[PDB]
Design a binder for these strands. Structure first.
Ligand SMILES: OC[C@H]1O[C@@](CO)(O[C@H]2O[C@H](CO)[C@@H](O)[C@H](O)[C@H]2O)[C@@H](O)[C@@H]1O
Ligand SMILES: OC[C@H]1O[C@@](CO)(O[C@H]2O[C@H](CO)[C@@H](O)[C@H](O)[C@H]2O)[C@@H](O)[C@@H]1O
Ligand SMILES: [Mg+2]
Length: 580
DNA sequence: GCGATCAGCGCGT
DNA sequence: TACGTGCTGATCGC
C-alpha cells in the first residue's frame, strides 16, 4: 500500500522541526557539482517531499539545513553535504548516518542503499535504488510521483531504523566509533573532496606526448622482434607470439591460457630480446592509459582540479578507497612513473604541498597487540625493523646482514602482516613452499609473542565469530570454521591481519579528526587534501611550513597511545613529487 | 551487434 | 601472503 506524504509546493514550519530523517537525493554516482533531484523530510509532524529548486531557494529551509541544533538522520550524508557545498549551501546537524552505521555493524553486507541496510532489521517497505533508477546505460530519474514516493519511503526507513541500529551499535560497543570517529570524519572527507587537488594539465599533456612517442618506437621494435604485428595488450595474442611462435618456456598458466605477468616475463628475459621490450611497453602503457589519460579525463577544465570521492563504507578492514580519480595509487616506486606527481601542485601561489606518513605503523601496532617483547624493544630503540628481523631469523650481527638478507626479511615482514601464507611468500621470494615456511618458523622463534597472538586471535575469531580493532571496528569471519583447508586458511589470515590493518585505519582516522581541530585552533590556512592509508597530504602557505613541521607529526603520533611509540616522517615542496 | 561482464594485468599502502 | 581502482581485451548475454 502506497505511503502517505505531502508533496509540498512550498516550505512550512512543520518541515523544520529540530529532528528529522532527511533525504537530499543525488542520483549521479559522482556527486561533485551534480544535481539534487528531490528532497524528502520525515519528522514528528509527518512526511514531506519538496522540489529542489523550491526548498533550496527558501531562506528558512537553507537556514534549517545549516543549523547544527536541528538534528538530521540520513544515509550517506557526505554525498548530500558535498552536492550542497557546490551549491554554496552548508549542511550541519547530521547526528546519524545509516550508511556508516550499517557499515560498522557488518562491512561484509555491502550495504550501498537504504533498502539494503533496512533489510538487516527485517524492514522492506522501501525499494532498492537500482530498482527505481535502473542500472547502467538504462539509468534514469523517474517521474515525480515515483520519485517522491521512493525518497519519502527512504526517509521513513531511516526515521524508523535509527533506534534499532544505534542499539545494536551500543551492544557491540561501537556507538562511539560511529558518533565520535566515522561521522566526524565524514565531514572532513567532504571538505577534502570539495577542495580538490590542483593539477598541472600542461605538464601532464607534455608527458603524454613523450610517452606516446616512446610507445610508438617500442611497439615497432616489438613487431620487428616478433616478425609480425599483433595486439601486444592482449594476453591471448601475446601468449601465442611468446609461447607458440617464439617457443619460450611456459613457466605458468592462467585459467584462460598462458601467464604473461611481469614476474613471468622477468624469468623469460634471457631467452629473447622481445621480452624486455614487452616489459618496457607495459610500463609506458600503464602510465599513458591509466594515469596520464586517466587523470586528464577527470580534471575539471575550469579549475584544473580533480575531486576524488572517498568511499568511506566499502573496505572490510576500515580503510578508505578513492575513486574518479583514485588518488591512492599514484606511481612512486619507479622514477619514471614518480614524475607524474610533479603534476599535482598547490591550489594557490606561494603555497606548498606537505606530506606526513607513519613509519611502519602496521608492525608497531602488531608489537602493541601481541605485546611481543623482542618486537616492542625493537621499536623502542627505533631500529631498522627489516635489518633487525634479518639479524634474528638468520642469526647474524647487524654488520653481517647483506642486502639480499634484508630484502627477504622485509618480505617476511610484509608477509607476517598479511597472514602466514608460505604460498604467497614463496611466490614473492621466488622460492619453494617449504623454504618459505622455514623462514616463517624462524620468525616465530624470534618473536614468540607474535606467534602466541596469531594462535590466540584465530581461536578468538572461532569462538566469537569475529575479530575487532583497537577502536572496536569488527569483521565477521564465518569461513573460520570451514572444512575446506584453503577457505579456512584465508579466514585465519584475515583474523590475523584485520586487527592490524583495521587498527592502523582507526589511528590515522582519529589523527585526521585531531589534526583538523588543531589546525582550526591555531588558525592555520593549511588543510587536508588526501589520505593514503598511512599518510596525510596537506597544502598550505609557505609561511606555515615550519609550524606544520612540528604540529602535524605530533598530532599523528599522539592520536593514540600504544605500548610502543608512533613515528611520523614528513616532507614538503612545490609539488607532490617534491614532498619527498 | 553492443552494452555488461569477466579475465588478466599492475599501481598504491 | 592483505586491502583497493580501473585500465585494455576477450567473452557473455539481451
Ligand atoms: O557516495 C559514496 C557512497 O555511495 C555508494 C553507494 O551508496 O557508492 C556510490 O558512489 C561511489 C562514488 O561515486 C561509486 O564508486 C559507487 O559505484 C556508487 O554506487 C557507497 O558505496 C559509498 O559509501
Ligand atoms: O595501431 C592500432 C592497431 O594496432 C593493434 C595491433 O595490430 O594494436 C596496437 O595498438 C593499440 C593502441 O595503442 C595497443 O593497445 C596494442 O597493444 C598494440 O599492439 C590493433 O589492435 C589496433 O587496431
Ligand atoms: Mg610509510
Amino acid at each position: 500500500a502506497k505511503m502517505a506524504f505531502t508533496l509540498a509546493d512550498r516550505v512550512t514550519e512543520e518541515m523544520l522541526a529540530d529532528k528529522a530523517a532527511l533525504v537530499v537525493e543525488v542520483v549521479e554516482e559522482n556527486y561533485h557539482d551534480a544535481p539534487i533531484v528531490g528532497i524528502a523530510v520525515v519528522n514528528e509532524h509527518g512526511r514531506f517531499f519538496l522540489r529542489p529548486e523550491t526548498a533550496l531557494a527558501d531562506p528558512q529551509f537553507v537556514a534549517w539545513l545549516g543549523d547544527e541544533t536541528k538534528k538530521k538522520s540520513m544515509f550517506d550524508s557526505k554525498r548530500a553535504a558535498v552536492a550542497l557545498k557546490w551549491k554554496g549551501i552548508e549542511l550541519c546537524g547530521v547526528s546519524f548516518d545509516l550508511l556508516l552505521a550499517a557499515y560498522l555493524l557488518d562491512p561484509a553486507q555491502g550495504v550501498d542503499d537504504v533498502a539494503a541496510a533496512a533489510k538487516m532489521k527485517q524492514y522492506e517497505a522501501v525499494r532498492p535504488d537500482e530498482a527505481v533508477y535502473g542500472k547502467g546505460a538504462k539509468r534514469a530519474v523517474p517521474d515525480e510521483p515515483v520519485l517522491a514516493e521512493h525518497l519519502v519511503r527512504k526517509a521513513a526507513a531511516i526515521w524508523e531504523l535509527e533506534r534499532p541500529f544505534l542499539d545494536e551499535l551500543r551492544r557491540n560497543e561501537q556507538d562511539r566509533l560511529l558518533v565520535e570517529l566515522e561521522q566526524p570524519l565524514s565531514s572532513i572527507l567532504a571538505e577534502m573532496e570539495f577542495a580538490g587537488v590542483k593539477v598541472d594539465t600542461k605538464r601532464l599533456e607534455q608527458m603524454g606526448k613523450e610517452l606516446a612517442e616512446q610507445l610508438g618506437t617500442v611497439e615497432q621494435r616489438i613487431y620487428e622482434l616478433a616478425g609480425q604485428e599483433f595486439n601486444i595488450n592482449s594476453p591471448k595474442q601475446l601468449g601465442v607470439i611468446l609461447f607458440e611462435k617464439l617457443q619460450l618456456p611456459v613457466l605458468k598458466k592462467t585459467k584462460t591460457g598462458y601467464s604473461t605477468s611481469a614476474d613471468v616475463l622477468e624469468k623469460l628475459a634471457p631467452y629473447h630480446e622481445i621480452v624486455e621490450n614487452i616489459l618496457h611497453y607495459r610500463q609506458l602503457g600503464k602510465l599513458q592509459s591509466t594515469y596520464i589519460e586517466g587523470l586528464l579525463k577527470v580534471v575539471r577544465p575550469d579549475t584544473k582540479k580533480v575531486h576524488t570521492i572517498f568511499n568511506q563504507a566499502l573496505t572490510q578492514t576500515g580503510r578508505l578507497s578513492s575513486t574518479e580519480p583514485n588518488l591512492q595509487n599514484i606511481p612512486i616506486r619507479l622514477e619514471e612513473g614518480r614524475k607524474i606527481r610533479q603534476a599535482f601542485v598547490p591550489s594557490e601561489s606561494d603555497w606548498l604541498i606537505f606530506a606526513a606518513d607513519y613509519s611502519q605503523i602496521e608492525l608497531r601496532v602488531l608489537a602493541h597487540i601481541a605485546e611481543d617483547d623482542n618486537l616492542m624493544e625493537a621499536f623502542r630503540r627505533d631500529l631498522d625493523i627489516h635489518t633487525k628481523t634479518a639479524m634474528d631469523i638468520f642469526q647474524v650481527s647487524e654488520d653481517e646482514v647483506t642486502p639480499n638478507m634484508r630484502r627477504q626479511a622485509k618480505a617476511v615482514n610484509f608477509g607476517i602482516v598479511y597472514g602466514i601464507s608460505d604460498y604467497g611468500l614463496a611466490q614473492n621470494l621466488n622460492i619453494s613452499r617449504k623454504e618459505a615456511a622455514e623462514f616463517i618458523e624462524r620468525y616465530f622463534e624470534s618473536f614468540p609473542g607474535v606467534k602466541r597472538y596469531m594462535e590466540n586471535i584465530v581461536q578468538e575469531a572461532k569462538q566469537k565469530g569475529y575479530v575487532t580493532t583497537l577502536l572496536h571496528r569488527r569483521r565477521y569471519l564465518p569461513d573460520i570454521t570451514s572444512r575446506n583447508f584453503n577457505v579456512r586458511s584465508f579466514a585465519e589470515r584475515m583474523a590475523m591481519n584485520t586487527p592490524i590493518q583495521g587498527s592502523a585505519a582507526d589511528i590515522i582516522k582519529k589523527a585526521m579528526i585531531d589534526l583538523n581541530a588543531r589546525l582550526k585552533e591555531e588558525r592555520l590556512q593549511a588543510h587536508l587534501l588526501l589520505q593514503v592509508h598511512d599518510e596525510l597530504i596537506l597544502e598550505a602557505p609557505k609561511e606555515e611550513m615550519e609550524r606544520l613541521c612540528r604540529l602535524v607529526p605530533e598530532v599523528m603520533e599522539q592520536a593514540v597511545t600504544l605500548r610502543v611509540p608512533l613515528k611520523v616522517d614528513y616532507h614538503y615542496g612545490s609539488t607532490w613529487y617534491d614532498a619527498k
